[PDB]
Amino acid sequence: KSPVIVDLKFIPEEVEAALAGAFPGREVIDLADPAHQERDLSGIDYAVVWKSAPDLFSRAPDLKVVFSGGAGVDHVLTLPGLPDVPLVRFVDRTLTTRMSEWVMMQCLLHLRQHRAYEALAKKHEWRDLSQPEAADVTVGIMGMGVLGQDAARKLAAMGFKVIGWSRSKRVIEGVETYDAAGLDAFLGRTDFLVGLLPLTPDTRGIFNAALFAKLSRNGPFGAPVFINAGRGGSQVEADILECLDSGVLGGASLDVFEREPLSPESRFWDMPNVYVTPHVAASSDVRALFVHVEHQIARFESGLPLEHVVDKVAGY
Amino acid sequence: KSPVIVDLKFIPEEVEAALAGAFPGREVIDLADPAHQERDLSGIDYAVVWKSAPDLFSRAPDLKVVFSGGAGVDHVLTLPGLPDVPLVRFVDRTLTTRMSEWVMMQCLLHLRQHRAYEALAKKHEWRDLSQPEAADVTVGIMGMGVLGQDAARKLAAMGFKVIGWSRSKRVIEGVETYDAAGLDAFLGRTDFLVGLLPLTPDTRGIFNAALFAKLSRNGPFGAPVFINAGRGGSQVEADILECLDSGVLGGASLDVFEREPLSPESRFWDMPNVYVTPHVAASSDVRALFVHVEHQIARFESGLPLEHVVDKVAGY
Ligand SMILES: NC(=O)C1=CN([C@@H]2O[C@H](COP(=O)(O)OP(=O)(O)OC[C@H]3O[C@@H](n4cnc5c(N)ncnc54)[C@H](OP(=O)(O)O)[C@@H]3O)[C@@H](O)[C@H]2O)C=CC1
Ligand SMILES: NC(=O)C1=CN([C@@H]2O[C@H](COP(=O)(O)OP(=O)(O)OC[C@H]3O[C@@H](n4cnc5c(N)ncnc54)[C@H](OP(=O)(O)O)[C@@H]3O)[C@@H](O)[C@H]2O)C=CC1
Ligand SMILES: [Cl-]
Ligand SMILES: [Cl-]
């Protein structure tokens, strides 16, 4: 049976733990192990990859299916020699549920004025603030795919008003959606903007000052919030900073950045209404990843269509 | 028609705003207005009260129904001269939904290691941490009433394992519940303990070091968390502090305190894994409060039973 190459820049202890009993009957070649640094990888059919080294595909020229370790494929699409074979992205209940946790947390942190209450606590000052309920806030989600839909449904269940935007219009109970041409109408209703878009050439720099200026000022805080857990390349950080400084944006939650890891010299670390997380909104459960890859391999070898195959021209 | 006395120690601008068009056809006597400081209040049937002055019931001896401005009645039950007539507590979708927001926020803040990521951000340090999903954590809620049930259902929908405890066993889909005698079994399964109990003589000092020592150490963080938004008198703050210092408790979210407002000299303000909020977990929407009171008055005057009447002997 073909081995499976594992080249995942994840927390090493998590990958190592998941290797036990993974891919039964196949050799598993974990490229984090120095013992494998010279192994020729010709004749091997499958690789599971995340932030892999530039030479990987020259070493493994006979791959039949490439599996991303994440939902996003904007990096793997750039790897030199990426083979002309199906590229399968990671889609799984574990990833989806994790993203929705992070999105819900940000919407609650902003709704419930967490930074204000923390500033009061720093002064040892007890002060109750006037407080809207979730239903007083419209959360607008750009990207109505696997992650956007789950987050929308969960936010609505917690009481937020929720609307969605994507290229085509999606039909979702309890969530009004807009297609591409509806962007401006969607923005004008949105108090908390949530980004769950892939990075593609068409989404590069989409979150910019002109867009933030179209967000609603009619909500309970009088100024919108920007929350991004898609990709950093979709935002213009110079504009985010300008808009936070001026008050065009009242706050932000950023999990993703134009250049990661985020520079230690970035202003974002110290800003009073910005929450920074280090690209952890939805971690890949490595056990679940390997179960997913196993399942797709079994489909492939039985002559069934692969699931979650990306359109390389579209970039997602 | 009888006037309605309003004596609510809430944010004044909120009460004032809600007075417009409230109680149509009745004089509304807002005791926050100095113009009313000498008004005799005999012959008046209804009062809506929160943190009211010790002399209120000597001024208003002819009340037929007393309405609490909150869900909790432990303070109003202590007011001198509280009349021997029905005491109606506040129960409303707005209050419930607000509590569930706060409970969800705390469970997510603790699950998602928010304080760790904030400490990293303070150092301008990008570091991903190993991260459990919600389903890896058991949230145990003490108090399975209006607030406890709603919070349990919402937490379960976001992926947490949820169990509940109260005096009698409650039947709730997707949430295993325990009765009084099941407390120890319940505690031993609980990673995040959430308090949503009233203060009564039987719940005074219930959250103490012996109880925290029975919480699970088998969860993903190896140490339990304590979250209280019931009443401060149910907890022993000396024990909370001892247990945080020793690591018996890994963290806490406290909305309520033994003596409020919380002393500026309290250690809780500066502790690295304690979130302090100033008794704001579920604010009373004053408009909704007045609609509720109006509805109960109409029932009363039509000969229908009042709803949400407290048992003064039980204290809730
Ligand atoms: N921060 C983190 O830890 C993580 C980040 N992510 C990011 O989240 C992204 C979304 O994942 P997922 O929901 O699974 O992806 P999906 O492919 O399921 O959804 C993508 C959505 O974006 C929309 N879209 C794409 N391009 C455009 C465009 N030009 N204009 C308008 N809408 C557009 C799609 O529209 P349509 O339906 O019309 O095609 C679709 O609704 C990933 O690509 C990845 O970058 C994912 C996991 C973790
Ligand atoms: N922090 C904040 O902003 C707010 C705090 N609160 C607090 O939340 C409390 C709960 O409100 P709500 O859910 O509406 O009240 P409910 O009366 O609906 O529920 C109370 C629950 O506590 C249980 N209980 C009471 N005494 C005991 C006991 N000795 N042992 C075990 N279980 C007990 C009851 O059990 P049983 O069902 O068997 O009677 C019931 O499940 C309020 O009393 C108030 O103090 C409320 C609003 C806002
Ligand atoms: Cl800011
Ligand atoms: Cl602490």
mmCIF file of C-alpha atoms and ligand atoms in Angstrom, chain A residues 115 244-245 249-252 267 270-275, ligand 3:
data_model
loop_
_atom_site.group_PDB
_atom_site.id
_atom_site.type_symbol
_atom_site.label_atom_id
_atom_site.label_comp_id
_atom_site.label_asym_id
_atom_site.label_seq_id
_atom_site.Cartn_x
_atom_site.Cartn_y
_atom_site.Cartn_z
ATOM 1 C CA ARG A 115 -12.601 45.885 27.498
ATOM 2 C CA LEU A 244 -9.503 52.587 15.072
ATOM 3 C CA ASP A 245 -7.578 55.804 15.752
ATOM 4 C CA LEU A 249 -14.069 51.389 13.935
ATOM 5 C CA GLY A 250 -14.991 51.096 17.606
ATOM 6 C CA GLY A 251 -12.956 47.926 18.034
ATOM 7 C CA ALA A 252 -11.679 44.778 16.398
ATOM 8 C CA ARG A 267 0.581 48.478 17.177
ATOM 9 C CA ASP A 270 -1.282 47.240 22.689
ATOM 10 C CA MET A 271 -4.486 48.730 21.335
ATOM 11 C CA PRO A 272 -7.240 49.156 23.848
ATOM 12 C CA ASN A 273 -10.149 47.781 21.751
ATOM 13 C CA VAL A 274 -8.307 45.150 19.679
ATOM 14 C CA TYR A 275 -8.202 41.477 20.573
HETATM 15 CL CL CL C 3 -8.452 50.127 19.734
#
